[PDB]
């Protein structure tokens, strides 16, 4: 079952306060759907960096009263790990036609 997924160990994908440049270093040469989460330069927000079509894409993660998320009406998740578990089985295409991947492979899995 999905309890086996590496996503359940937050250390496989949460790279703390790493900046954009460090995120890009980490994902170089990785297969599509490899991802990480980190703090954003936008203080108090987070970011997801994910490989799509061989390129690293960066998405801000909002922190709102109803939860974390990428956009309304999806700012719903009580933690980063709930967000990550959701998008392990939800393509980001519902947010942007150019992000048609799941959060498939934690960078340190």
């Amino acid at each position: 079952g999905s309890e086996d997924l590496p996503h359940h160990d937050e250390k496989t994908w949460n790279v703390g306060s790493s900046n954009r440049n460090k995120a890009e270093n980490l994902l170089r040469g990785k297969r599509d759907g490899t991802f990480l989460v980190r703090e954003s330069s936008k203080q108090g927000c987070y970011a997801c960096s994910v490989v799509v079509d061989g390129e690293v894409k960066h998405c801000v993660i909002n922190k709102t009263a109803t939860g974390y998320g990428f956009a309304e009406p999806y700012n719903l998740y009580s933690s980063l790990k709930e967000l990550v578990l959701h998008y392990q089985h939800t393509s980001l295409v519902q947010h942007n036609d150019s992000l048609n991947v799941t959060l498939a492979y934690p960078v340190y899995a």
Binding site: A47, K57, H58, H95, N96, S98
Partner: peptide
């Protein structure tokens, strides 16, 4: 610069 997610 971040992806537009709306």
């Amino acid at each position: 610069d971040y992806m537009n997610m709306t």
